[PDB]
Amino acid sequence: NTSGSGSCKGRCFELQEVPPDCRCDNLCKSYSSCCHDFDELCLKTARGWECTKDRCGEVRNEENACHCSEDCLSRGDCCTNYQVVCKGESHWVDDDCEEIRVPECPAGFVRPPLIIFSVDGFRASYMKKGSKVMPNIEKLRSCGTHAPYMRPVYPTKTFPNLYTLATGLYPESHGIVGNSMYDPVFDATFHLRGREKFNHRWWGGQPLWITATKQGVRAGTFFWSVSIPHERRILTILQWLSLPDNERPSVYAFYSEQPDFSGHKYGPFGPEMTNPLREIDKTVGQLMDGLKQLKLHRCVNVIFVGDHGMEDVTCDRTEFLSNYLTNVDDITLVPGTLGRIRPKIPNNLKYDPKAIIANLTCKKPDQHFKPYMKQHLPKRLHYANNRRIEDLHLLVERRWHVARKPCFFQGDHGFDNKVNSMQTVFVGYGPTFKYRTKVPPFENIELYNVMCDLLGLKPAPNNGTHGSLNHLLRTNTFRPTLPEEVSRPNYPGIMYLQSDFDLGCTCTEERHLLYGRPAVLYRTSYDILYHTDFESGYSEIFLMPLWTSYTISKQAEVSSIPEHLTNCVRPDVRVSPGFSQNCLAYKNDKQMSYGFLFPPYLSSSPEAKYDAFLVTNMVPMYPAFKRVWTYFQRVLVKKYASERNGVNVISGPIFDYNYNGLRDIEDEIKQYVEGSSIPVPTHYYSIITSCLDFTQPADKCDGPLSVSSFILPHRPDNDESCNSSEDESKWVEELMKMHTARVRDIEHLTGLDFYRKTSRSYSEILTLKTYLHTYE
Numbered sequence: 001n002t003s004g005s006g007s008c009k010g011r012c013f014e015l016q017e018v019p020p021d022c023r024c025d026n027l028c029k030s031y032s033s034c035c036h037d038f039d040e041l042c043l044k045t046a047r048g049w050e051c052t053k054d055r056c057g058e059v060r061n062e063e064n065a066c067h068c069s070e071d072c073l074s075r076g077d078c079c080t081n082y083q084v085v086c087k088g089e090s091h092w093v094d095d096d097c098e099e100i101r102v103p104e105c106p107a108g109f110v111r112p113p114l115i116i117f118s119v120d121g122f123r124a125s126y127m128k129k130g131s132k133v134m135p136n137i138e139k140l141r142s143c144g145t146h147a148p149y150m151r152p153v154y155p156t157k158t159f160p161n162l163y164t165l166a167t168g169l170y171p172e173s174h175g176i177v178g179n180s181m182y183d184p185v186f187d188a189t190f191h192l193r194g195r196e197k198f199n200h201r202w203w204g205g206q207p208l209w210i211t212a213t214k215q216g217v218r219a220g221t222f223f224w225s226v227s228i229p230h231e232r233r234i235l236t237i238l239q240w241l242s243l244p245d246n247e248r249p250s251v252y253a254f255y256s257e258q259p260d261f262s263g264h265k266y267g268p269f270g271p272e273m274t275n276p277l278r279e280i281d282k283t284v285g286q287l288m289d290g291l292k293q294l295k296l297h298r299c300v301n302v303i304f305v306g307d308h309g310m311e312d313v314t315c316d317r318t319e320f321l322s323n324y325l326t327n328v329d330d331i332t333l334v335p336g337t338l339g340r341i342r343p344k345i346p347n348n349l350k351y352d353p354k355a356i357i358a359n360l361t362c363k364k365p366d367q368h369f370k371p372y373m374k375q376h377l378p379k380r381l382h383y384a385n386n387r388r389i390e391d392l393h394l395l396v397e398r399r400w401h402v403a404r405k406p407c408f409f410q411g412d413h414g415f416d417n418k419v420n421s422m423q424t425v426f427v428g429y430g431p432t433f434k435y436r437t438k439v440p441p442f443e444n445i446e447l448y449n450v451m452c453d454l455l456g457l458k459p460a461p462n463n464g465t466h467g468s469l470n471h472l473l474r475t476n477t478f479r480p481t482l483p484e485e486v487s488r489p490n491y492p493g494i495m496y497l498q499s500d501f502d503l504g505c506t507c508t509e510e511r512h513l514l515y516g517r518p519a520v521l522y523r524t525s526y527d528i529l530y531h532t533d534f535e536s537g538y539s540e541i542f543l544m545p546l547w548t549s550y551t552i553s554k555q556a557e558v559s560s561i562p563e564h565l566t567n568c569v570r571p572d573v574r575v576s577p578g579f580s581q582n583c584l585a586y587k588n589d590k591q592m593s594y595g596f597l598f599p600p601y602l603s604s605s606p607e608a609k610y611d612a613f614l615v616t617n618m619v620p621m622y623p624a625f626k627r628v629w630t631y632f633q634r635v636l637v638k639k640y641a642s643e644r645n646g647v648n649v650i651s652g653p654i655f656d657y658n659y660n661g662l663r664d665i666e667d668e669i670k671q672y673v674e675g676s677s678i679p680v681p682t683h684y685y686s687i688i689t690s691c692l693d694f695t696q697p698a699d700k701c702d703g704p705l706s707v708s709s710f711i712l713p714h715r716p717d718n719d720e721s722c723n724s725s726e727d728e729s730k731w732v733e734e735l736m737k738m739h740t741a742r743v744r745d746i747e748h749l750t751g752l753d754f755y756r757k758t759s760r761s762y763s764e765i766l767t768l769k770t771y772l773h774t775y776e
């Protein structure tokens with residue numbers, strides 16, 4: 001027919017591409033193009049997967065799944081336990097750890113092979129079960145390189161996280177934004193069940209196997225048809241490692257759907273969680289026993305990685321949109337541990353997203369979801385820049401579900417990736433990995449760079465920070481390089497006259513720039529301005545500081561903005577009026593007010609406070625945002641300075657009007673103060689750095705640093721905070737925790753490079769820039 005039927009004799013699980021002729025590969029069943037003898041020749045199950053005493057030295061029966069004869073080592077098809085049963089050897093788990101300082105690979109191996117062992121729904125807390133349940137896995141964790149947990153990407157669903165690992169891209173970037181999704185361009189829907197998921201048009205970016213392929217590294221067939229058992233896949237990977245030098249792949253992948261399947265049906269803390277965990281460990285033991293049989297246990301690099309965790313979710317904790325909305329039949333909702341709303345039909349003139357958002361906003365005192373326009377989602381989630389992401393998004397609180405209209409499950413996932421239950425596992429074992437080393441938790445977007453390094457691959461452009469995980473590897477082939485500055489700063493003097501201004505208003509480096517001047521990595525003209533208490537880089541294009549740096553010691557006296565100085569704004573004689581803002585625009589804008597990047601409340605002396613009221617320290621701020629900002633400046637900064645023995649703060653604006661996580665150009669800026677060229681930031685950031693050894697002051701730190709950061713949305717109302725009518729001590733801190741950010745996120749949104757002049761390696765700094773303070 002279209003395929004036909006030849007013989008799979010000597011072709012079982014071939015890697016060669018073969019369609020005119022009949023196939024014998026891992027996915028031949030999936031296309032119904034196998035040969036008549038494929039099942040009988042390749043999918044053998046007779047007598048199981050383990051050797052026994054009776055089978056030692058047996059006469060070779062080809063019917064058996066694996067063999068226990070003397071020849072099986074030469075012919076390459078013993079069972080994984082042949083040597084321990086029939087030759088008195090030991091399981092790999094029973095052997096003590098021995099540090100693999102150099103790869104002990106057979107001749108013909110140019111590089112250590114990489115085997116990626118991925119598991120679905122593996123909570124990091126499962127490793128607390130330890131050697132009791134998973135001895136093989138614990139040995140990999142103990143004698144290898146391991147993190148306490150690895151942060152997944154949002155949403156914490158299976159395929160978005162699996163592909164993020166393969167690409168190093170955020171789901172908005174590689175295109176798999178959920179297990180269920182609708183692409184308006186395709187007019188088609190992607191689902192966990194169906195053929196549309198196999199269409200490659202959905203899968204963007206460059207996955208690892210393509211990156212290896214385009215650079216001459218042989219990738220084994222990673223993906224298996226469902227009907228092939230796990231044990232057969234393990235024996236096949238071992239057989240591939242025994243292939244001749246001109247065919248042996250360098251990178252291998254094993255994926256297991258457990259313990260995710262059981263976790264959904266039993267709950268993450270269920271007593272029969274143990275059985276799937278043991279079964280996974282037994283599969284790992286078969287791999288390690290087999291690698292030891294092939295003398296590859298001290299040659300291969302093994303990665304044990306998960307995609308997400310699992311949380312207690314039952315139908316008794318389900319929110320229904322029908323208790324909020326009157327048009328549930330006019331909408332389409334992606335349900336579950338997350339919510340995405342869409343009109344059921346286009347041309348429905350009775351569909352208003354504004355009315356839907358309002359009717360979902362703080363309508364119940366314990367409302368277990370929060371509506372969001374995707375552009376207002378916390379920037380750490382990086383979930384806006386895709387046509388497959390609906391404008392209306394619902395962030396569901398942990399342990400809860402959202403449906404459209406009113407259990408067989410006790411567990412589910414998909415929540416905010418900072419939720420502790422969604423954290424998953426990472427283990428690195430092999431010659432290139434470190435021995436008995438614990439590394440701090442990291443995000444799964446960084447693994448693509450490491451896997452490329454472990455294969456000598458040049459990474460495709462991705463959202464990992466290359467070099468941020470060099471501390472995982474005994475041998476690092478990537479040396480990070482500081483980006484070069486593009487725009488150098490003007491250091492202007494006192495060059496203008498206060499009479500030359502038509503403002504319309506009325507009325508250091510050793511201490512405040514502790515980690516070096518941020519580098520402007522884009523072409524602009526900006527001025528570095530010095531003051532007693534703060535230093536800034538003032539942009540002449542955007543009429544405000546790009547960054548503002550100041551240090552607050554543990555011993556600091558808070559002050560109030562004086563009543564006479566409340567509305568004081570002063571011209572800066574170092575900046576021209578044409579490159580300055582004006583207070584008339586703020587008066588002529590009914591909705592926009594102004595704030596100050598360096599807080600006047602924290603001025604050192606009454607004379608120094610006059611600098612805090614300079615026009616060059618002024619930024620546009622909604623009255624709603626000013627409530628958040630003023631509490632942060634008047635209360636929170638000193639509190640942080642008291643807890644952390646002083647803090648250095650870098651604050652400034654962020655413009656991202658197309659919600660792509662990147663720095664806006666002037667053309668992409670779409671709002672300005674009324675009758676003015678002053679741009680309105682979409683967000684405001686701050687970077688709060690101190691000495692990790694808090695017995696040292698922030699301005700006199702010797703070793704590693706500690707950082708916390710946020711990116712607050714700049715919004716005209718506080719509808720995000722349901723308790724905003726109360727005092728700021730009751731809601732402001734909670735809002736800031738939800739919008740915590742890595743310094744790296746700020747760098748993308750500002751085009752600035754931080755921590756350039758410090759006393760640690762660039763690799764250590766890159767790890768600091770990727771840190772996310774979770775408060776969880």
Ligand SMILES: *[C@@H]1O[C@H](CO)[C@@H](O[C@@H]2O[C@H](CO)[C@@H](O[C@@H]3O[C@H](CO[C@H]4O[C@H](CO)[C@@H](O)[C@H](O[C@H]5O[C@H](CO)[C@@H](O)[C@H](O)[C@@H]5O[C@H]5O[C@H](CO)[C@@H](O)[C@H](O)[C@@H]5O)[C@@H]4O)[C@@H](O)[C@H](O)[C@@H]3O)[C@H](O)[C@H]2NC(C)=O)[C@H](O)[C@H]1NC(C)=O
Nearest residue numbers: 172173174175203204205385386387461462463660661748
């Ligand atoms: C995380 O890292 C990624 C990758 O480094 C960054 O995304 C990149 O952003 C830059 C802009 O700063 C884009 O450059 C533009 O490229 C286009 C032409 O791009 C074409 O060619 C590239 C190279 O082959 C290809 O990757 C592009 O693929 C896009 O289209 C595919 C089909 O639709 C899609 O599968 C793929 O994911 C990508 O989609 C992009 O567009 C959609 C629509 O906006 C968006 O939803 C999605 O997230 C992607 O952004 C494309 O064929 C030029 O015309 C421009 O002038 C400009 O040079 C890169 O294209 C883009 N690369 C990728 C892989 O996304 C992220 O910014 C970064 N995030 C953060 C937060 O830092």
Ligand SMILES: C[C@@H](c1ccc2ccc(O[C@H]3CC[C@@H](C(F)(F)F)CC3)c(C(F)(F)F)c2c1)N1[C@@H]2CC[C@H]1C[C@@H](C(=O)O)C2
Nearest residue numbers: 116118159162163165166197198203207208209223253255
């Ligand atoms: C549905 C999808 C698929 C299936 C199983 C999957 C099981 C695991 C897995 O990911 C793990 C973590 C990452 C690692 C590494 F990539 F880093 F090595 C690999 C294991 C993925 C993913 F998402 F990554 F691709 C799967 C992807 N297939 C569609 C489109 C890609 C695929 C190919 C196939 C075809 O036509 O052949 C058609």
Ligand SMILES: *[C@@H]1O[C@H](CO)[C@@H](O[C@@H]2O[C@H](CO)[C@@H](O)[C@H](O)[C@H]2NC(C)=O)[C@H](O)[C@H]1NC(C)=O
Nearest residue numbers: 324325326327328350352355356357358359360
């Ligand atoms: C959003 O909520 C408002 C207020 O409840 C809804 O407006 C009401 O619609 C009902 C229809 O059942 C009518 O009684 C009135 O026209 C409205 N007022 C009151 C007091 O009920 C509105 O329909 C809701 N919109 C959506 C999309 O859910």
Ligand SMILES: [Zn+2]
Nearest residue numbers: 157178179180
């Ligand atoms: Zn989904």
Ligand SMILES: [Zn+2]
Nearest residue numbers: 180181182189
């Ligand atoms: Zn859908």
Ligand SMILES: [Zn+2]
Nearest residue numbers: 222223224255
């Ligand atoms: Zn698979």
Ligand SMILES: [Zn+2]
Nearest residue numbers: 121158260264
């Ligand atoms: Zn699942």
Ligand SMILES: [Zn+2]
Nearest residue numbers: 230256280283
């Ligand atoms: Zn398994």
Ligand SMILES: [Zn+2]
Nearest residue numbers: 656662663664
């Ligand atoms: Zn942008």
Ligand SMILES: [Zn+2]
Nearest residue numbers: 704705764768
């Ligand atoms: Zn550090």
